[PDB]
């Protein structure tokens, strides 16, 4: 006897990855960038820049 | 092939933590993927040695 036409279903699950990277900033240079330790001199401005 | 892969990028975000004195900013990005074709859609040949 003939074969009836066949039907089939299939599913694929997701795959999960991630990416990352570090950005560590120094200990003497953010409060010139945060302006806390900034003192008013013609020398510290250049260092903040 | 023309489209051998389905790819989803999540949303970037920052997670930060203090160590090594300074600040340690840590970028992350969750991302997922899953093939988009019945049967194999990629192969290699190993040409040289």
């Amino acid at each position: 006897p003939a074969d009836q036409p066949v039907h089939n279903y299939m599913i694929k699950r997701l795959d999960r990855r991630s990416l990352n990277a570090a950005f560590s900033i120094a200990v003497e240079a953010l409060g010139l960038i945060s302006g806390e330790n900034l003192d008013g001199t013609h020398i510290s401005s250049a260092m903040r820049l | 092939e023309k489209a051998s892969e389905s790819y989803f990028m999540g949303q970037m975000q920052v997670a930060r933590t203090e160590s090594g004195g300074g600040l340690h900013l840590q970028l992350t990005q969750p991302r997922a993927n899953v093939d988009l074709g019945v049967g194999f859609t990629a192969a290699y040949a190993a040409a040289a040695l």
Binding site: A29, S34 | E18, L23
Partner: peptide
């Protein structure tokens, strides 16, 4: 009529720890 927007202020000063360590 007494509870948590100064008891607001009060609990969650919480999500501030760096106040960075870097100049």
């Amino acid at each position: 009529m007494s509870v948590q927007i100064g008891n607001g202020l009060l609990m969650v000063v919480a999500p501030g720890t760096l106040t960075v360590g870097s100049a």
